[PDB]
Design a protein around this ligand. Structure first.
Ligand SMILES: [Mg+2]
Lengths: 101, 61, 87, 59
RNA sequence: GUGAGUAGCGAAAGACGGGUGAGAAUCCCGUCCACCGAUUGACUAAGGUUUCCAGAGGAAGGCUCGUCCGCUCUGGGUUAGUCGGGUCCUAAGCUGAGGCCGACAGGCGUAGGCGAUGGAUAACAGGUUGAUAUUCCUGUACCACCUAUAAUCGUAUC
RNA sequence: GAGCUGUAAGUAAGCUUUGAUCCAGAGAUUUCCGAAUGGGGAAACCCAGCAUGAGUUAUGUCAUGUUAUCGAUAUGUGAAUACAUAGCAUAUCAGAAGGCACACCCGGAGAACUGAAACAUCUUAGUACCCGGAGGAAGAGAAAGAAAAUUCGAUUCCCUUAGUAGCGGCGAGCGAAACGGGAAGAGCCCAAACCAACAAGCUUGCUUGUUGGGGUUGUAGGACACUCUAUGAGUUACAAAGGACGACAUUAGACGAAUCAUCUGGAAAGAUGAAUCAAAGAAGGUAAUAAUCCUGUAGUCGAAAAUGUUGUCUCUCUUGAGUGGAUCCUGAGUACGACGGAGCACGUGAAAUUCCGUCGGAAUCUGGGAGGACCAUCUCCUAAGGCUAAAUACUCUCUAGUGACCGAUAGUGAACCAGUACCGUGAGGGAAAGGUGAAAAGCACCCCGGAAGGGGAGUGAAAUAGAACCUGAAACCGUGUGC
């Protein structure tokens, strides 16, 4: 449904109305990671070798039914359908009709 | 991979079966005791290329 | 044939007799005779005595459930010609 | 157990009444007589009941 | 919870100087003192199954305390042709090819097997480790088997 | 069709768009103990024999291969005793054993307390235990039957007959069947009389010994006597037993319609507004209560393959009736009777029909049995050989799904790695356990401390949710204060 490399649009969250890209999708818990969306402030272990007494800020994963794949030819995040006469499913946006990648 | 780059010769099965079992996995489990965490992912691969060399000799029966 | 799983390099009783003796951890089920014809068809040396001993499984306990470790047979070769059968 | 070697008759069970109808159990037994019946091989020593001996008594 | 900060603390001689430590009547080292000594001493069977040993621990267990430990974490420890067994033998007993008995299950028993608490059976001193010693290595031995062998004896002999 | 390396958190070293992980079918490996099977044993271990093979100048040591006991076909081979028979030595042999679903079924054996207001015949009960046999079901089964009509036409299971007829220290109590309505519904093979051969008789025998042909019933049917038909008819679930070609079902899987913006909020699925799809408003999750966000549902769609169910195509195999009347046949120690027991609803009672132990013991179609002692005529039926599907009883399991059923002292003993800690020599007994948050963002850094544990600062909607982790009652122990 949603994979890494394509834009999204958060529809339901504290950081809604924000585009971005997918970083890494947890497939079992159905959670995706988008940059700049639901960022943390981790109290890191400053006895680690890397830093000197600080607070990390890495993005936190959101569930896959909070992003929605967009093709703004009519300024709209759409849903996905599947067409194939080529031996492999080419992904189709049903609300506009164009072939996306 | 390895699965059908084998089926090369009948006689060179056992002469490579004894070459990897005896002379590779025995060196790679002595060096694990005296200190090596350099390639501790070669021990899985030179063991799963023995199973492929003792499966093909059943097809030649 | 390979009935020598690992060597063992512990503190004194394994590495403070290294002028002629060496210590392996053999597989079970085997003799002290087969080890004479197993450390000779690898390293090309000539043994003089092989001694074996058996340890029981001993009890470890981690978490909230106890279990036993694995039993092991230990062999101690002693050479006549050549040296340095471990590196 | 014991059977007629010719026919195959054997024991039974059943109660044992009295003059006041108290009932223990008991056992009936076929009248088995040892006799030398000629069969294949040797004429062995077998167990034959005495009702199968009225006609077929071979030596 | 009350009984209550009550009954207990499981025979029995300890005293001091020094260290150690956040903390010591209790742990370690020293001197004096007392107790067993046909045993409270020294080796092996039965039984238990890591407790043994060195380095770190102080929440629980120890009838108090604890720096300590038979308790917790890490890493180690058991070496045999000759000692005790098996590849040798049989007692009481147990099991039993055919066989003999019994509603079925099954009970008894001959040849043969199993079974030491007994018969047979070739190695002893000294040294050493933080934990093993007739096992490891120092010096001298001995019983079984195999291979070369020479003096060889020959219907010798098994 | 892009992330994966069981719990997996944690790092390490890797593999994958030349399709990895994951899912389904089919083959390969499957150490030692176990019916244990070379012998031994205190299961998971110890000792061997004969063949080929490595190794050593040679023994010691290893690998593969086999070797239990009965049975029954065989080949030998001397039997005490000349012939010859029980013994013995071998080749073979998908033959046998044990495990079970403690369920249902059929046989063998088979109690007690209890009810009778005591108790013995009786009831509890042919039940519980135990033992043997199997099956996907098993048992019964093709009228020596029910019955009293111008009778119908195997068995089995439900409804009614009926708590009626009966049996009963006539007490307590036990308790039918046929008729009638239904679920289901097929019937067939031998024995004998006999004809033809081959091993023993001039034998007198087609009968005896073996093997093939014949032949199956009561309206009396077959041997034997006669003609009139001889290709259609099949089953391998009964009645004799041996293959292909694609239809459909099962174990992976794919497609699958339609909602946008504001208010309170840490967050919209909520209320207020406008839109839409609907063979699809069942259900679960997503920062709160979603027909339209996700996984899906109604509906279509899909098999390289391995089983499974049937259609027709082979292929095996097969004679079908009638009339006559002289002769032969139509299951024997059988049926039945007396003595003793069991079972039929029925307790020896006037006791029929049915089986068991013991002795007695028949008739042969003008025969034999039954119709509740028995006898006489009318009436139905053919005993002493065997094999048979379905309707019916169950559930340790696999898949879809329901519930005016439970919600952590409940429902399984068991939602936690349960028949486990632990108790017992042994059979056997047997509990305790669940919840942070939407997301680990699980408390960086300073300070008192030896450390625990604290108090600030910080993450969070809230830590007065900090792993003694949701809400937090009473008992019981505290500190403060008006009378
Ligand atoms: Mg029964």
């Amino acid at each position: 449904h949603i994979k890494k490399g394509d834009n999204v649009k958060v529809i339901a969250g504290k950081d809604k109305g924000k585009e971005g890209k997918v970083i890494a999708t947890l497939p079992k818990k159905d959670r995706v990671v988008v940059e700049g969306v639901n960022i943390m402030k981790k109290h890191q272990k400053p006895t680690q070798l890397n830093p000197e007494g600080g607070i990390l800020e890495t993005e936190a994963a959101i569930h896959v039914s909070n992003v929605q794949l967009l093709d703004p030819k009519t300024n709209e995040p759409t849903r996905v359908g599947y067409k194939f006469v080529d031996g492999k499913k080419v992904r189709i946006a049903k609300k506009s009709g164009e072939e996306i990648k | 991979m390895k699965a059908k780059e084998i089926r090369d010769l009948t006689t060179s099965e056992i002469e490579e079966q004894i070459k990897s079992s005896k002379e590779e996995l025995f060196n790679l489990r002595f060096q694990l005791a005296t200190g090596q965490l350099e390639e501790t992912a070669r021990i899985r691969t030179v063991r799963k290329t023995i199973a492929r060399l003792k499966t093909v000799a059943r097809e030649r029966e | 044939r390979d009935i020598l799983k690992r060597p063992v390099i512990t503190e004194k009783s394994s590495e403070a007799m290294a002028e002629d003796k060496y210590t392996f951890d053999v597989d079970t089920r085997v003799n002290k005779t087969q080890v004479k014809m197993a450390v000779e068809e690898i390293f090309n040396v000539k043994v003089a005595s092989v001694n074996i001993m058996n340890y029981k499984p001993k009890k470890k306990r981690m978490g909230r459930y106890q279990g036993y470790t694995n039993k092991r047979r230990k062999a101690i070769v002693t050479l006549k010609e050549g040296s340095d059968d471990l590196f | 157990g014991k059977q007629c070697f010719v026919t195959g008759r054997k024991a039974s069970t059943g109660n044992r009444r009295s003059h006041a109808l108290n009932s223990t159990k008991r056992r009936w037994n076929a009248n088995l007589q040892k006799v030398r019946i000629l069969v294949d091989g040797k004429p062995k020593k077998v167990w034959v009941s005495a009702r199968a001996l009225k006609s077929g008594k071979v030596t």
